[PDB]
Amino acid sequence: PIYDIN
Amino acid sequence: EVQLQESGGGLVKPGGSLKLSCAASGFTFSTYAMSWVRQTPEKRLEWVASISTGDNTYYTDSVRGRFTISRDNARNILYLQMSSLRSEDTAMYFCTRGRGDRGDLFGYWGQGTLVTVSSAKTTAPSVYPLAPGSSVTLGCLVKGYFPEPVTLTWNSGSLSSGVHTFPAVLQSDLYTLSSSVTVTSSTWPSQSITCNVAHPASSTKVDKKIEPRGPTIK
Amino acid sequence: DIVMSQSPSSLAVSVGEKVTMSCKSSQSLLYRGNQMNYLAWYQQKPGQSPKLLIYWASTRESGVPDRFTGSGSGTEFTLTISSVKAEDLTVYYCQQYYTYPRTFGGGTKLEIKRADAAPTVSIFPPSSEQLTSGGASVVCFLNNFYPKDINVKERQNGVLNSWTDQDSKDSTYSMSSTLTLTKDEYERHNSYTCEATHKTSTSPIVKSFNRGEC
């Protein structure tokens, strides 16, 4: 659960 | 082979006292006139004091009596004792050596030591790492610290270009600095990247490894 | 306290063109006894200490690019840049040593002209360690662009900012943007954006995120 890292 | 090094700067509260020192190397220290020039945060320059080869001392009007310029020809050091300081003294202070051997003409300068004079306490910084294509960019942020001088590096100062350290911005008596750095996507995670920050006043060196954000909640 | 004065404080030259500074004096610095002018020039690349450029109002210091020349005399001196490079980005000062209370001019800054560029934006949510200690701050990084005039941004109330000194290498600027906040208030919203409005961009350029915790 990071909402898009990359 | 003509080096000059400021020392002993930092911070004192209004009315206190300081003694800047400037160590020299690479010339017969005695046979040259020397000076001190400060640069206000306005970025305007101001001559402070000069001293000839015959120990004659010369000062500007704003700092008479308070500041004292002195030389030690035995150890090749040039001091600037600064007692009873107004807020006008808040400036970056350089030691100079005479360009020739006749006068005080500012030919060779040191790097400059910072002297901020205010009441606020010496507070250590807070180094926060920043983490998120084809070429990634990591960041580092330094919040809450007060004197001015801090030195942010990357991987113990091994990083090339792409770095863009931004100047500190004081607000409510706490400087706040940030910095960027860009590499390739194939260059990061695999290779470690650490944001190092030095804050000489609180006498702290802080290293912060830049790791990607974690898939953890509750 | 002899007063020095320099003409156009700000400038805007391009590579290869001519540049001329002017340093006016409030008292003759030319001693008849030696027929010598007591005035010098200095260059201070931003972030460094100044270096002695011209002295005796004409002599170039040993190791100075020969594209610099200093003429004028008495109470009106000048510094000449024939073919300006990109490494010559700074401000220039003129000193007098005819008399004590040694004085410097107000200084003449100079911008350089390159082709307009687009700002690379990169946005970073607050660190895991910042929220735990209380407070949180968003950051977006504007990097490498010729027009230092660009507005970047939905309620921007407690923001900070910072600018680089124009790159001596590639004649470009950069910008930070510290959207500071607290811990709770960061969680109670979700509209986090950084848009740019440039000299090349009324059709804008953005870089945003939806909060990592959603």
Author numbering:
A (entry chain C): 8 to 13
B (entry chain H): 1 to 132, 139 to 224
C (entry chain L): 1 to 153, 160 to 220
Q: Which of the paper's sentences describe this entry?
A:
C-C chemokine receptor 5 (CCR5), a G-protein-coupled seven-transmembrane protein, is one of the main entry co-receptors for HIV and blocking it can prevent infection. Two X-ray crystallographic studies are presented of the antibody RoAb13, which binds to the peptide PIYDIN, which is part of the N-terminal domain of CCR5. We have demonstrated that the monoclonal antibody RoAb13 binds both native CCR5 and a free peptide corresponding to a short sequence of the CCR5 N-terminal domain, and that binding to the receptor blocks HIV replication.
The work presented here reports the conformation of the PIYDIN sequence in the 31-residue peptide analogue of the CCR5 epitope (hereafter referred to more simply as the ‘31 peptide’) bound to RoAb13 by co-crystallizing this synthetic peptide containing the core epitope sequence with the monoclonal antibody RoAb13. The insights gained into the three-dimensional structure of the CCR5 N-terminal domain bound to an anti-CCR5 antibody may inform the design of better peptide analogues for use as immunogens in vivo. These analogues may ultimately provide the basis for active immunization vaccines to stimulate an antibody response to native CCR5 that will block HIV infection.
